[PDB]
Design a protein around this motif. Structure first.
Motif, PDB file in Angstrom:
ATOM      1  N   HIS A 196       0.807  -1.213   0.000  1.00 17.84           N
ATOM      2  CA  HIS A 196       0.000   0.000   0.000  1.00 17.84           C
ATOM      3  C   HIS A 196       0.841   1.263   0.000  1.00 17.84           C
ATOM      4  O   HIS A 196       0.307   2.365  -0.057  1.00 17.84           O
ATOM      5  CB  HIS A 196      -0.956   0.016   1.193  1.00 17.84           C
ATOM      6  CG  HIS A 196      -2.079  -0.966   1.079  1.00 17.84           C
ATOM      7  ND1 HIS A 196      -2.953  -0.974   0.014  1.00 17.84           N
ATOM      8  CD2 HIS A 196      -2.478  -1.965   1.901  1.00 17.84           C
ATOM      9  CE1 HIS A 196      -3.836  -1.941   0.179  1.00 17.84           C
ATOM     10  NE2 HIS A 196      -3.570  -2.558   1.316  1.00 17.84           N
ATOM     11  N   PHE A 197       2.156   1.104   0.069  1.00 18.08           N
ATOM     12  CA  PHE A 197       3.056   2.250   0.059  1.00 18.08           C
ATOM     13  C   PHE A 197       3.998   2.189  -1.129  1.00 18.08           C
ATOM     14  O   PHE A 197       4.242   1.119  -1.680  1.00 18.08           O
ATOM     15  CB  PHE A 197       3.875   2.315   1.349  1.00 18.08           C
ATOM     16  CG  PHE A 197       3.053   2.556   2.576  1.00 18.08           C
ATOM     17  CD1 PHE A 197       2.399   3.754   2.759  1.00 18.08           C
ATOM     18  CD2 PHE A 197       2.951   1.587   3.556  1.00 18.08           C
ATOM     19  CE1 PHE A 197       1.648   3.979   3.892  1.00 18.08           C
ATOM     20  CE2 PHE A 197       2.200   1.803   4.689  1.00 18.08           C
ATOM     21  CZ  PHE A 197       1.548   3.000   4.859  1.00 18.08           C
ATOM     22  N   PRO A 198       4.522   3.354  -1.532  1.00 18.56           N
ATOM     23  CA  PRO A 198       5.540   3.498  -2.579  1.00 18.56           C
ATOM     24  C   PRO A 198       6.805   2.705  -2.270  1.00 18.56           C
ATOM     25  O   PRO A 198       7.235   2.656  -1.119  1.00 18.56           O
ATOM     26  CB  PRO A 198       5.855   4.992  -2.542  1.00 18.56           C
ATOM     27  CG  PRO A 198       4.597   5.621  -2.066  1.00 18.56           C
ATOM     28  CD  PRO A 198       4.006   4.658  -1.081  1.00 18.56           C
ATOM     29  N   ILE A 199       7.396   2.098  -3.291  1.00 20.57           N
ATOM     30  CA  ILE A 199       8.623   1.336  -3.109  1.00 20.57           C
ATOM     31  C   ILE A 199       9.655   1.815  -4.110  1.00 20.57           C
ATOM     32  O   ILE A 199       9.500   1.610  -5.309  1.00 20.57           O
ATOM     33  CB  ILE A 199       8.382  -0.175  -3.275  1.00 20.57           C
ATOM     34  CG1 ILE A 199       7.362  -0.660  -2.244  1.00 20.57           C
ATOM     35  CG2 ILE A 199       9.687  -0.948  -3.138  1.00 20.57           C
ATOM     36  CD1 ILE A 199       6.972  -2.099  -2.409  1.00 20.57           C
ATOM     37  N   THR A 200      10.706   2.460  -3.613  1.00 22.17           N
ATOM     38  CA  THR A 200      11.645   3.166  -4.476  1.00 22.17           C
ATOM     39  C   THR A 200      13.101   2.842  -4.144  1.00 22.17           C
ATOM     40  O   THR A 200      13.867   2.450  -5.022  1.00 22.17           O
ATOM     41  CB  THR A 200      11.429   4.702  -4.403  1.00 22.17           C
ATOM     42  OG1 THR A 200      12.093   5.234  -3.249  1.00 22.17           O
ATOM     43  CG2 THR A 200       9.937   5.048  -4.330  1.00 22.17           C
ATOM     44  N   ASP A 201      13.479   3.004  -2.878  1.00 29.54           N
ATOM     45  CA  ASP A 201      14.864   2.797  -2.456  1.00 29.54           C
ATOM     46  C   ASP A 201      15.166   1.329  -2.214  1.00 29.54           C
ATOM     47  O   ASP A 201      16.185   0.806  -2.662  1.00 29.54           O
ATOM     48  CB  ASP A 201      15.156   3.588  -1.181  1.00 29.54           C
ATOM     49  CG  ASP A 201      15.393   5.055  -1.450  1.00 29.54           C
ATOM     50  OD1 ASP A 201      16.160   5.365  -2.387  1.00 29.54           O
ATOM     51  OD2 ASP A 201      14.818   5.895  -0.724  1.00 29.54           O
ATOM     52  N   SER A 202      14.264   0.674  -1.494  1.00 30.60           N
ATOM     53  CA  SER A 202      14.443  -0.715  -1.098  1.00 30.60           C
ATOM     54  C   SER A 202      14.231  -1.668  -2.270  1.00 30.60           C
ATOM     55  O   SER A 202      14.254  -2.886  -2.105  1.00 30.60           O
ATOM     56  CB  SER A 202      13.462  -1.046   0.027  1.00 30.60           C
ATOM     57  OG  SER A 202      12.733   0.108   0.423  1.00 30.60           O
ATOM     58  N   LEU A 203      14.036  -1.097  -3.454  1.00 31.23           N
ATOM     59  CA  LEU A 203      13.620  -1.834  -4.644  1.00 31.23           C
ATOM     60  C   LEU A 203      14.420  -3.117  -4.894  1.00 31.23           C
ATOM     61  O   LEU A 203      13.850  -4.197  -4.975  1.00 31.23           O
ATOM     62  CB  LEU A 203      13.679  -0.910  -5.866  1.00 31.23           C
ATOM     63  CG  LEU A 203      12.584  -1.014  -6.925  1.00 31.23           C
ATOM     64  CD1 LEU A 203      12.706  -2.313  -7.689  1.00 31.23           C
ATOM     65  CD2 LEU A 203      11.230  -0.902  -6.279  1.00 31.23           C
ATOM     66  N   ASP A 204      15.737  -3.005  -5.022  1.00 27.26           N
ATOM     67  CA  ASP A 204      16.560  -4.183  -5.291  1.00 27.26           C
ATOM     68  C   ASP A 204      16.531  -5.170  -4.123  1.00 27.26           C
ATOM     69  O   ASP A 204      16.776  -6.364  -4.296  1.00 27.26           O
ATOM     70  CB  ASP A 204      18.000  -3.784  -5.641  1.00 27.26           C
ATOM     71  CG  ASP A 204      18.470  -2.551  -4.882  1.00 27.26           C
ATOM     72  OD1 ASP A 204      17.940  -1.449  -5.147  1.00 27.26           O
ATOM     73  OD2 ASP A 204      19.376  -2.679  -4.029  1.00 27.26           O
ATOM     74  N   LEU A 205      16.210  -4.670  -2.938  1.00 28.46           N
ATOM     75  CA  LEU A 205      16.209  -5.503  -1.741  1.00 28.46           C
ATOM     76  C   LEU A 205      14.913  -6.298  -1.570  1.00 28.46           C
ATOM     77  O   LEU A 205      14.968  -7.508  -1.373  1.00 28.46           O
ATOM     78  CB  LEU A 205      16.522  -4.664  -0.495  1.00 28.46           C
ATOM     79  CG  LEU A 205      16.660  -5.372   0.860  1.00 28.46           C
ATOM     80  CD1 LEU A 205      17.456  -6.673   0.763  1.00 28.46           C
ATOM     81  CD2 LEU A 205      17.278  -4.435   1.886  1.00 28.46           C
ATOM     82  N   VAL A 206      13.755  -5.639  -1.653  1.00 30.92           N
ATOM     83  CA  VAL A 206      12.478  -6.344  -1.470  1.00 30.92           C
ATOM     84  C   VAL A 206      12.208  -7.372  -2.571  1.00 30.92           C
ATOM     85  O   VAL A 206      11.370  -8.258  -2.415  1.00 30.92           O
ATOM     86  CB  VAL A 206      11.250  -5.383  -1.280  1.00 30.92           C
ATOM     87  CG1 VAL A 206      11.698  -3.948  -1.091  1.00 30.92           C
ATOM     88  CG2 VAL A 206      10.256  -5.515  -2.422  1.00 30.92           C
ATOM     89  N   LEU A 207      12.934  -7.260  -3.676  1.00 36.45           N
ATOM     90  CA  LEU A 207      12.842  -8.247  -4.739  1.00 36.45           C
ATOM     91  C   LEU A 207      13.548  -9.538  -4.339  1.00 36.45           C
ATOM     92  O   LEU A 207      12.995 -10.627  -4.498  1.00 36.45           O
ATOM     93  CB  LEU A 207      13.422  -7.701  -6.043  1.00 36.45           C
ATOM     94  CG  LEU A 207      12.442  -7.455  -7.190  1.00 36.45           C
ATOM     95  CD1 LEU A 207      11.113  -6.994  -6.660  1.00 36.45           C
ATOM     96  CD2 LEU A 207      13.006  -6.419  -8.122  1.00 36.45           C
ATOM     97  N   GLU A 208      14.763  -9.423  -3.810  1.00 39.63           N
ATOM     98  CA  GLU A 208      15.507 -10.613  -3.400  1.00 39.63           C
ATOM     99  C   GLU A 208      14.761 -11.357  -2.292  1.00 39.63           C
ATOM    100  O   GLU A 208      14.681 -12.586  -2.303  1.00 39.63           O
ATOM    101  CB  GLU A 208      16.940 -10.268  -2.978  1.00 39.63           C
ATOM    102  CG  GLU A 208      17.088  -9.800  -1.538  1.00 39.63           C
ATOM    103  CD  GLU A 208      18.543  -9.627  -1.117  1.00 39.63           C
ATOM    104  OE1 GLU A 208      19.392  -9.354  -1.994  1.00 39.63           O
ATOM    105  OE2 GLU A 208      18.834  -9.762   0.094  1.00 39.63           O
TER     106      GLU A 208
END
Lengths: 752, 178
Positions: free
Chosen positions: A277-289
């Motif tokens: 429900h929130f924007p995902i911008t910085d943690s992008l490469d991390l929340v994918l792994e």
């Protein structure tokens, strides 16, 4: 008096009619002491009910709203109850084993898997200002249902937003205490639930607006740091209800990303669910792994798998530069077959825009071996829109679709797997009527992408059926002139087709000699519909032995497919339908119902065929329209279906008249005729199938009928069918002429 | 041969190898019920697989309701999960199927009196006490509940093989007494 009316509403046991009872209620002077009785009730239904009554009474009612924002640490602990009733003497350890035997159904057999160790021991409301005092008390009651009831009530109070009533000043303080202190859960479903803390946290989301500038949210995200999953839990659910009022998103998201890896599956679930429900911008490469790892874990069942697929789907939708890594591709194949429906749906939604052969293949497997239809529809939709499916997909499934209908699919043909479509025992559960249905559906999908020649044969009955239709579809695309395909001798097939030779060739001809006589051998009857199917499909678009097919076909889906082919060809002036029409029309108006499958897909095309003008002659006619009238009632060319509505009257054919009712224009004709003579008998079976806006016309005439003794019983009967519908909004659609009456009468009813 | 047996129940146990505070577990789970006067254990139920688990303070776990050895082991693992979340250092040792209950239907009636005489030693038949005949087989140690209806019910099995092995020692005999 009224106290009596309220004391019957008071009376209450066992149903939703009591919801209708609460749904019923409106306005009165005073009492609610009886409402509290419910909000303390142990039922999940009464607490809601009762709290719903409290909700009714909101006006210029005063409310104190002083909020002490204090994060005071408690040492209390709130559970289901005090447990004092657990201080009791346990029966003998002999009477107990007896009980275990009964509960675990161990009758007649010996059970020596328990011992002595196993059985050891370790270790007044009447005043209103007192009905609010009473709940502030229950907010912290030792009985969880009282805590829920309590919290559920406040939700109602702060529901409306608009006498004198001070609201507890330590309200928030009590919520906060519950959130960290209450440790009661419901483990009934794999997704854990905190009945109390939940309802609590929802309140906090309504309180927030009317609340002084605070450090509450910053404080809640602090819960995510705890080592107790239960307080973490509390944090997440509260934050979920407050997600709108969350600023400093980056500070919450950072933690949520962290918790995607919690050892606890609920923290993982709630974590991802909130993060979507929130924007995902910085943690992008991390929340994918993280998400990919969770997906690959191959933990047989984790509740969070769906939430993780959602989080991926999101990253990829919101950031279109990013595309799924080819390697991780093999990690989502399993998801199309996953036992849990939310995963199956989620994966079919995450691939909705991609075009990899591999995924193309798996979407097809889905349409063949999926339990739920709603879910198969997702996969069907995904393929029908395609004009670029690979040939090797068309070829592979064109002969997978034609495997024996009595043997399972080969593990070698599918990447997916279930014990329901791949075991010789599973099949006999699904039944061939489904197995065939789901093939007919895949068949309609894979035909829009260019039709290569299928040299490969399999030689089963079904194989012939499909490869036959396949060539028909081919021919229809290249307007190939018709060549009367040749049907060989019964013998011929019995030599080639592996599925027919599961049967006594002799017993077979006996069935062929005369059906309607269910042969004793179990394999012949089935193989009979497989045969009638193949020949009809081989001789198509010859329709000689099509009439047979419609008469025996069990699988409704195939009759549909077949009617499609017929109609598709008819539209192209590529077939002759006359003899098949007649043979169909007859067989249908006489109880052979498979033929409906044709008339629905051919639908309105009938009214512009020679035959139709020739039906206004058969004595058979109303027996026919009885079964099909829905199909034609929708037509635009009304004058045509017109001749039949006149007939349904003359013959008092109820079923055919009801069908003609769902259309307004025909009421106008019906009623305008009922007034010329009241056939009350049919009126009883007819009127309530039309627009009730007409009824007010039949009141006076139906009273004469009773006033003077005429059809007294009937008139009186329908009369009490119509009276309860006098409170009905007249329709503006109808003829302005009939309003000159619907209003003239409707008026005299209020006269005086 | 002829027909195929259908499973109706599976009982199994595990040791969570840990001392459980039965009372706490009762006040922390809405889906658990606890009655010492009736029984010295806690009854916890989950919804899917619809099952029931008896939880002893020793950390012994009895699990019933399952319709397969897979379901059984599965629901067993879920109940352990709840215990772990509930604060106890639970483990999952010694899982074991204790009992299987299957059913059959050979679609034809049987002459109980005849079967009972030919085997008065292995089965008891009193139609003025209980409907149907209870037959005690010795290899494998299986108990069969045989009814005139033609319906059979087998219990006492520890592994599915015993169901087949046993329902294949009786068919011949159920043939003779049609």
């Amino acid at each position: 008096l009224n106290t009596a009316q309220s004391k019957v509403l008071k009376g209450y046991t066992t149903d939703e009619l009591v919801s209708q009872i609460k749904e019923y209620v409106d306005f009165t002077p005073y009492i609610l002491k009886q409402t509290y009785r419910l909000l303390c009730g142990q039922a999940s239904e009464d607490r809601r009910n009762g709290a719903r009554i409290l909700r009714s009474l909101m006006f210029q009612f005063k409310l104190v709203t002083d909020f002490k924002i204090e994060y005071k640490e408690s040492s209390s602990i709130y559970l289901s109850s005090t447990g004092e009733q657990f201080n009791v003497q346990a029966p003998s350890i002999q009477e107990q084993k007896r009980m275990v035997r009964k509960i675990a159904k161990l009758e007649h057999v010996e059970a020596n898997f328990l011992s002595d160790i196993d059985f050891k021991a370790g270790s007044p409301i009447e005043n209103v200002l007192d009905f609010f005092e009473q709940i502030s008390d229950n907010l912290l009651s030792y009985e969880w249902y009282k805590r829920h009831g309590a919290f559920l009530a406040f939700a109602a109070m702060f529901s409306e937003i608009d006498i004198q009533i001070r609201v507890d000043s330590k309200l928030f303080s009590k919520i906060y205490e519950i959130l960290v202190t209450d440790k009661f859960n419901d483990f009934v479903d794999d997704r854990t639930v905190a009945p109390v803390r939940d309802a609590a946290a929802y309140l906090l989301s309504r309180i927030y607006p009317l609340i002084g500038p605070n450090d509450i949210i910053e404080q809640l995200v602090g819960f995510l740091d705890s080592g107790d999953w239960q307080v973490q839990f509390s944090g997440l659910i509260a934050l979920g209800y407050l997600k709108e009022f969350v600023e400093d998103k980056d500070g919450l998201c950072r933690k949520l990303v962290s918790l995607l890896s919690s050892p606890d599956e609920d923290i993982k679930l709630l974590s991802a669910e909130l993060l979507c429900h929130f924007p995902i911008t910085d943690s992008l490469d991390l929340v994918l792994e993280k998400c990919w790892k969770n997906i690959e874990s191959e933990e047989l069942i984790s509740v969070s798998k769906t939430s993780n697929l959602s989080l991926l789907t999101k990253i990829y939708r919101e950031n279109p530069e990013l595309s799924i890594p080819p390697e991780r591709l093999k990690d989502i194949f399993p998801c199309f077959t996953s036992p849990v429906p939310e995963v199956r749906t989620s994966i079919l939604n995450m691939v909705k825009n991609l075009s990899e052969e591999s995924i193309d293949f798996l979407v097809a497997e889905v349409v063949l071996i999926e339990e739920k239809d709603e879910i198969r529809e997702m996969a069907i939709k995904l393929l029908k829109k395609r004009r670029d499916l690979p040939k090797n997909l068309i070829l592979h499934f064109m002969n997978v679709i034609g495997g024996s209908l009595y043997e399972p699919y080969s593990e070698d043909d599918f990447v997916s797997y279930e014990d329901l479509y791949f075991t010789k025992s599973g099949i006999n559960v699904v039944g061939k009527d489904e197995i065939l249905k789901n093939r007919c559906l895949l068949f309609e999908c894979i035909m829009k992408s260019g039709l290569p020649d299928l040299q490969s044969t399999i030689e089963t009955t079904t194989s012939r059926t499909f490869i036959s239709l396949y060539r028909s579809v081919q021919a229809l695309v290249k307007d190939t002139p018709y060549t009367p395909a040749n049907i060989e001798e019964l013998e011929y097939y019995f030599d080639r087709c592996k599925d027919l030779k599961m049967a006594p060739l002799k017993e077979f001809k006996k069935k062929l000699s005369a059906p309607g006589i269910r042969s004793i051998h179990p394999m012949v009857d089935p193989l009979y519909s497989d045969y009638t199917r193949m020949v009809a499909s081989i001789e198509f678009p010859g329709l000689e032995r099509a009439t047979a097919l419609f008469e025996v076909e069990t699988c409704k889906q195939f009759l549909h497919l077949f009617s499609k082919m017929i109609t598709e060809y008819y539209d192209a002036e590529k077939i002759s339908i006359d003899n098949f029409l007649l043979k169909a029309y007859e067989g249908l108006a006489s109880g052979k119902d498979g033929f409906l499958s044709f008339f629905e897909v051919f639908n309105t095309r009938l009214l512009a065929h020679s035959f139709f003008h020739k039906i206004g002659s058969l004595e058979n006619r109303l027996d026919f329209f009885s079964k099909t009238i829905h199909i034609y009632t929708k037509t635009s060319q009304i004058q045509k279906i017109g001749f039949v509505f006149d007939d349904a009257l003359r013959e008092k054919n109820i079923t055919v008249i009801n069908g003609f009712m769902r259309s307004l224009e025909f009421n106008e004709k019906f009623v305008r005729k009922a007034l010329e003579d009241l056939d009350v008998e049919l009126l009883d079976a007819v009127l309530m199938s039309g627009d009730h806006s007409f009824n007010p016309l039949f009141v006076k005439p139906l009273l004469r009928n009773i006033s003077g003794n005429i059809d007294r019983e009937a008139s009186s009967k329908v009369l009490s069918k119509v009276i309860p519908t006098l409170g009905f909004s007249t329709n503006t659609k109808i003829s302005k002429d009939l309003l000159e009456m619907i209003e003239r009468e409707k008026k005299s009813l209020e006269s005086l | 041969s002829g027909i195929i047996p259908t499973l109706q129940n599976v009982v199994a146990t595990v040791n969570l190898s840990c001392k459980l505070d039965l009372k706490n577990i009762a006040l922390r789970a809405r889906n658990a019920e606890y009655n010492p006067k009736r029984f010295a254990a806690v009854i916890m139920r989950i919804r899917e697989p619809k099952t029931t688990a008896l939880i002893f303070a020793s950390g012994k776990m009895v699990i019933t309701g399952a319709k397969s050895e897979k379901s059984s082991r599965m629901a067993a693992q879920r109940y352990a999960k709840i215990i772990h979340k509930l604060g106890f250092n639970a483990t999952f040792d010694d899982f074991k199927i204790q009992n299987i209950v299957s059913s059959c239907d050979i679609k034809f009636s049987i002459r109980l009196e005849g079967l009972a005489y030919a085997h008065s030693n292995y089965c008891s038949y009193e139609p003025e006490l209980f409907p149907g005949l209870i037959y005690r087989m010795v290899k494998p140690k299986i108990v069969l509940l045989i009814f005139v209806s033609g319906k059979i019910v087998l219990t006492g099995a520890k592994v599915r093989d015993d169901i087949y092995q046993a329902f294949n020692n009786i068919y011949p005999v159920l043939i003779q007494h049609r």
